[PDB]
């Protein structure tokens with residue numbers, strides 16, 4: 001590969017030079033003949049697979065603290081090598097775990113919020129042994145991150161994978177989500193995205209309220225055991241009722257959403273170690289709720305109901321009634337969160353901050369992998385600065401990865 | 414391998430076999446994706462295999478592969494490359510090649526129309542006056558009093574690279590842009606440079622906001638020449654809004670005919686450095702990009718003011734509001750004037766339908782998600798949720814350098 005790749009911003013003419021791509025470790029899925037950039041998704045490490053992965057990471061950590069080649073560096077390398085040799089794995093030091101998590105975020109090409117990457121509270125839950133313990137750790141995480149509406153980004157890291165039959169998993173895809181219920185008539189109550197998981201919960205013993213916004217229980221797997229159900233204490237779940245600054249009828253739609261976005265189904269990979277349970281949370285960009293959660297056809301799908309209330313002509317698509325309603329919905333979301341003092345960021349501010357971040361990273365780090373398809377917001381793309389920004393996408397490690405859904409793999413005891 | 418693309422809204426899965434037919438590179442590697450880079454990255458010996466490949470797929474498409482006509486054509490092209498260092502396409506081949514360049518254009522959301530393309534053969538042209546005549550005929554045919562019709566005019570192919578035909582304008586119809594003493598820009602900033610070249614070559618600029626530029630036409634490698642397109646051929650739409658009666662007072666207009674004139678058509682090794690082609694607008698091209706890009710007409714503030722919007726915080730989404738109203742005005746104006754235009758909802762729906770057709774009858778459809786998804790309201794259009802595979806098939810339209818960075822006078 002060429003040593004220097006250039007990216008241009010077509011609005012500012014600013015040109016940046018990427019050297020960081022040379023540290024790329026995993027594959028994108030693209031080839032020289034085909035690009036898979038819009039594709040959503042394109043038994044453990046053996047001793048020999050693990051050695052060079054650990055060393056690569058340890059080298060990187062010690063390079064970051066400006067102690068590369070030091071005695072402490074050679075010693076740590078030696079101790080890790082010993083541990084892999086005699087146990088087929090190793091344990092990260094707390095300092096290394098913290099560095100790794102922060103860098104997994106820093107390296108997450110799909111995330112527009114990375115300007116905040118170095119402010120991440122890391123909760124070390126590697127001593128956890130049971131589902132009840134996992135629940136305690138998750139409650140503490142939710143309460144800390146929620147902070148009464150002044151959200152703080154955080155991750156909780158449960159024990160790494162060993163042989164693959166003792167995995168810790170949060171079965172939920174997010175810590176906080178609403179239930180979806182398929183009706184006999186084929187309609188759906190609640191959030192259609194969560195129907196499958198909701199059914200699993202009901203089968204596991206959950207008694208569902210069968211409402212539009214029922215917070216799902218946590219379904220927690222510790223040490224490869226069958227997963228267990230827990231109800232998040234409702235006082236720990238911050239929610240925001242959605243109203244509009246101009247339209248007084250908006251609150252009559254009875255919408256609300258939860259304050260804390262917390263992904264709980266990804267795998268954190270550090271130095272060849274695999275943490276299959278690492279729920280992390282930040283705060284929302286408005287469009288995630290206002291465009292995707294509310295206006296996607298396969299989600300709450302409210303555009304029509306809002307358009308009717310707006311008295312829009314909905315006979316021709318060229319009236320742009322969908323676009324008009326979409327903006328008002330997103331206005332309402334931003335206004336409801338700001339009024340209730342729950343942290344949220346609009347897509348203009350988030351994308352402008354991301355460009356600033358990206359430029360700093362090109363300066364200090366030699367690049368910043370970014371997935372344009374994901375970085376550009378789902379509405380009003382070209383009036384945000386990221387639309388005009390060329391981006392190089394590549395996979396650095398440590399990283400957050402996708403993993404199969406646990407019910408597809410779990411060996412029921 | 415066979416590749417699957419999923420639509421995450423409909424759960425429809427399609428299988429791509431067509432990508433196996435490509436030979437040209439995308440720029441990505443196994444480790445770096447360049448999907449959002451705008452521009453990533455003959456001889457007798459290079460020429461014949463490219464000719465062969467092209468002749469072969471032409472004859473495979475009329476179901477006469479390995480026929481006498483096919484055999485003779487391969488022989489005929491062989492002889493001609495050997496004797497003359499190039500070859501000439503039959504008319505049937507020229508038409509097939511141009512339609513297929515469009516069909517293969519991964520960045521075009523308009524391809525459901527690909528096989529309805531009026532092809533004008535201008536390969537007998539020798540002078541800039543000849544070019545002007547061909548271009549005027551194109552513009553008149555394609556404009557059709559508002560009932561727009563897709564067309565392409567093809568001028569002589571490249572020979573030695575010293576005798577190129579080029580249309581210097583980036584589009585056939587575009588508005589001039591002027592640098593002001595006060596540092597700002599009058600008209601369209603995208604064309605400031607081109608405008609200065611016209612002025613420097615003798616164009617007398619009216620210095621308005623929407624002055625149609627002259628054509629600058631280069632024939633057979635010679636210095637380009639200026640021509641004014643007869644005004645009765647230039648269809649324009651005054652932009653007004655269906656509810657905001659103050660909108661027409663913004664003095665906005667645009668032309669009806671989008672006609673890209675700066676691209677290179679490649680067919681079977683032959684390069685056509687002048688092939689202006691035209692269709693009709695998708696509304697967002699004008700209403701979002703031309704009017705609202707910071708580096709273009711940049712009218713959001715002005716509109717937002719007239720709507721009395723709170724402009725202090727970005728979180729009031731005042732920009733988004735102004736953007737939607739502008740695009741409503743553009744659609745309404747073109748529709749009221751009976752000038753062909755498509756909204757991004759209709760155009761993207763048609764593209765999904767087109768993708769389904771292509772997968773069925775052709776085994777795939779190369780598409781660039783970065784370009785196909787509209788510059789506003791992305792995820793409320795079906796293409797946002799549509800996985801797409803991007804790859805390069807030939808014949809194709811390609812970028813080429815601006816003529817003024819290469820031309821010696």
Ligand code: HEM
Pocket residue numbers: 101105108110111112113114116120153154155280281282283284285288345350374400
């Ligand atoms: C602090 C405020 C944050 C904001 C505003 C933010 C914003 C976003 C947005 C808008 C997306 C795309 C979401 C989607 O459309 O599904 C995203 C994705 C992502 N974020 Fe961030 N994020 C934040 C915090 C975090 C944190 C704390 C982490 C990890 C420590 C993180 C890691 C990721 C990852 C891995 C993705 C890709 C998710 C996927 O592929 O499904 N983000 N972020």
Ligand code: HEM
Pocket residue numbers: 511515518520521522523524526530563564565690691692693694695698755760784810
């Ligand atoms: C007939 C109706 C048509 C519609 C609605 C349409 C729509 C579009 C749009 C929206 C784009 C993206 C434009 C941009 O963002 O700059 C585009 C690009 C493109 N179109 Fe189409 N188009 C049409 C006709 C045609 C025709 C007739 C041809 C050629 C024969 C063509 C070939 C191309 C090519 C090569 C591009 C890529 C331009 C570039 O890479 O800069 N299109 N089209």
Ligand SMILES: Cc1cc(N)nc(CCc2cc(CCCN(C)C)cc(C(F)(F)F)c2)c1
Pocket residue numbers: 113173193261262263280281282283284285287288289292293
């Ligand atoms: C930490 C964090 C902060 C932030 N602002 N956003 C995120 C992304 C979370 C997210 C997940 C998901 C996945 C849910 C649906 N599948 C399970 C089917 C969706 C969204 C959404 F829809 F974009 F808002 C957002 C994560």
Ligand SMILES: Cc1cc(N)nc(CCc2cc(CCCN(C)C)cc(C(F)(F)F)c2)c1
Pocket residue numbers: 523583603671672673690691692693694695697698699702703
């Ligand atoms: C044939 C055709 C039909 C159609 N509807 N659209 C096109 C693309 C035309 C087009 C060109 C260009 C290039 C001019 C700007 N640069 C010089 C900075 C831009 C756009 C737009 F508006 F940005 F989408 C659209 C071509």
Ligand SMILES: C[C@H](O)[C@H](O)[C@H]1CNc2nc(N)[nH]c(=O)c2N1
Pocket residue numbers: 037038039040373374375421797798799800801
């Ligand atoms: C098909 C396409 O890749 C898919 O719909 C992507 C597009 N861009 C996205 N961008 C974000 N932020 N989130 C998403 O879920 C998606 N979905």
Ligand SMILES: C[C@H](O)[C@H](O)[C@H]1CNc2nc(N)[nH]c(=O)c2N1
Pocket residue numbers: 010387388389390391448449450451783784785
């Ligand atoms: C950097 C990025 O590739 C560039 O801004 C692209 C994004 N998508 C686009 N999409 C279309 N249709 N037209 C464009 O000019 C662009 N510009």
Ligand SMILES: [Zn+2]
Pocket residue numbers: 030034035036037441445446447448
């Ligand atoms: Zn790629």
